[PDB]
């Protein structure tokens, strides 16, 4: 896992961008597209959501805090099964939340990139 | 007669309950396969009580194979015989053919496959035989597997063990052996000559497909060519799209990745991988019943996950499987709305969804670019693959 220069979003979402993504500033927050011209990019939006993540999510430790998310899998092709992670953190009031997709063969991915994304993410 | 004289008295040269000679057995095999009257033959052998006999003392169960495989295919207004015989033999050899690449089709499952198989080579048209293909000696990075080699996965040596369990650990060094080879599509493309390209296309089509059933065809196995024509035929394509489509699959593509596909499938964890010419995916097969113009309901009905998984590793049913696919992908997108793709649309400008409704002569190049995209990934969701349409417009251009 690796970043090199932060981005910062009048909301007042500030992150940093994944080495080999193409960053978008986006409504939100920031949608990184993996860079070149592969055959199954990963995909990562990181965004500021002012209401609150829904119950009944299995939750998981994210540092020195607790993260919320879900995994959803739907038919894709060739390249494999499409993987969809959700999740959430709280960040003061509000709750910083992350979406990632990407193609996997080999069962559910284990998400690295985006789970450093949502980790190192700030409320501020 | 005239073949059934000569399997008689060759059966009276061994004991009751003991199995012929394997030379015995290859020379029932061969005057089977060479015998002009297939039907009248079982007529006879099961007048004289010596059509049980036959499956009883032959012999073990990869020369039964060769047997079943060849009567099942042969054969036609007296196969209910052949079957029939086959049954009440199996009372006694409860094994038969179940075993080693065939251990999840029950015996008389593999008897209606081959049946179903040869019925569907000579309706569809891809009975005839192949010639002898110059294969690819590769054994890794792009194109190694058995598009390019001719070796089934299905012959691949296990996975060591400990191997395995780094698979499951998700182990780098061990994920990258079994993985895609390719990471930039275009610099792949960009180190072939035009001249090494049409030699891609070549290995990967004129090879004799690599079949689990290679004796219900009547003589030799066919072509892939031959096969991906009749598919082409059968689902209102192009042979050229089906083999770019598979060039492309087959180019990122390796040895040691078709032994992860076929055997973490088949494995306790069942696996949903994609297999084979066209890598499809297990689930994908079964969800859309992709096989159901070479093997009838009755079959398919009993069909295991795993027996599902190991068809997918022969040639044919995987060029079947893959032709439905690209068809449904076709006719799915037939029924979108353009104004809902704004991505694909933004991609590909000169898409034409009406076209895909029809043969792909008449399909814009964008069409190709599109449906590319969208059979290494989910179809007709506006996320595009960035790197695959080009990869497979290549492969198109070379055929
Ligand atoms: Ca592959
Ligand atoms: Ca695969
Ligand atoms: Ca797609």
Redesign the interface.
Same mark, same amino acid.
């Given at each position: 896992v690796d970043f090199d220069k932060t981005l910062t979003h009048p909301n007042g979402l500030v992150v940093e961008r994944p080495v080999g993504f193409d960053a978008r500033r986006s409504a939100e927050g920031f949608r990184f597209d993996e860079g070149?011209?592969?055959?199954?990019?990963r995909?990562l939006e990181v965004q500021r959501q002012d209401a609150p993540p829904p119950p009944d999510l299995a939750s998981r430790r994210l540092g020195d805090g607790e993260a919320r998310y879900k995994v959803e899998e739907?038919?894709?092709?060739?390249?494999?099964?499409?993987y969809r992670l959700w999740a959430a953190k709280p960040a003061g009031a509000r709750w910083i939340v992350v979406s990632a997709?990407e193609?996997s063969?080999?069962?559910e991915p284990?998400f690295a990139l985006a789970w450093a994304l949502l980790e190192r993410a700030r409320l501020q | 007669t005239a073949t059934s004289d000569l399997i008689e008295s060759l059966i009276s040269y061994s004991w009751d309950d003991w199995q012929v000679t394997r030379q015995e057995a290859r020379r029932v095999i061969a005057a089977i396969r060479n015998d002009n009257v297939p039907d009248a033959t079982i007529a006879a052998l099961d007048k004289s009580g010596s059509l049980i006999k036959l499956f009883q003392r032959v012999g073990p169960p990869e020369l039964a194979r060769s047997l079943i495989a060849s009567i099942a295919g042969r054969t036609t207004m007296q196969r209910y015989q052949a079957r029939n015989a086959l049954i009440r033999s199996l009372i006694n050899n409860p094994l038969g053919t179940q075993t080693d690449n065939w251990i999840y089709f029950p015996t008389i499952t593999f008897f209606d496959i081959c049946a179903d198989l040869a019925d569907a080579a000579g309706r569809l048209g891809f009975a005839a035989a192949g010639a002898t293909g110059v294969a690819s000696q590769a054994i890794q990075g792009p194109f190694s597997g058995v598009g390019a080699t001719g070796v089934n996965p299905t012959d691949l040596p296990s996975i060591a063990f400990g191997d395995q369990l780094k698979?499951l650990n998700?182990d780098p060094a061990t994920?990258t052996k079994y993985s895609?080879p390719?990471?930039?599509?275009?610099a792949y493309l960009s180190q072939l000559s035009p001249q090494d390209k049409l030699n891609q296309a070549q290995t990967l089509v004129g090879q004799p497909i690599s079949t689990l059933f290679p004796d219900a065809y009547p003589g030799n196995p066919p072509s892939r060519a031959k096969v991906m024509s009749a598919a082409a035929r059968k689902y209102d394509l192009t042979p050229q799209l089906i083999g770019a489509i598979i060039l492309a699959?087959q180019r990122?593509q390796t040895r040691d990745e078709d032994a992860?596909?076929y055997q973490?499938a088949v494995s306790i964890?069942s696996? !949903?991988? %994609?297999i084979g010419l066209?890598?499809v995916?297990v689930?994908?097969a079964i969800?859309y019943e992709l096989f159901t113009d070479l093997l009838g309901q009755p079959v398919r009905r009993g069909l295991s996950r795993k027996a599902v998984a190991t068809l997918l590793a022969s040639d044919e049913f995987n060029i079947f499987a893959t032709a439905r696919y690209i068809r449904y992908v076709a006719n799915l997108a037939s029924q979108q709305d353009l104004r809902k793709l704004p991505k694909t649309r933004g991609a590909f400008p000169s898409i034409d969804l009406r076209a895909y409704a029809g043969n792909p002569r008449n399909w814009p190049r964008d069409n190709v670019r599109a449906l590319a995209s969208?059979?290494?990934?989910?179809?007709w969701d506006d !996320?595009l %693959?960035?790197?695959?349409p080009?990869?497979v417009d290549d492969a198109y251009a070379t055929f």
């Open positions: 070149g011209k592969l055959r199954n990019p995909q739907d038919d894709g092709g060739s390249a494999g099964s499409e997709s193609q063969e080999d069962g284990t | 698979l998700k994920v895609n390719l990471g930039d599509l275009g699959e990122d992860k596909d973490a964890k696996a !949903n991988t %994609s066209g890598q995916v689930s994908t969800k969208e059979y290494t990934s989910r179809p !996320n %693959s960035p790197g695959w080009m990869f």
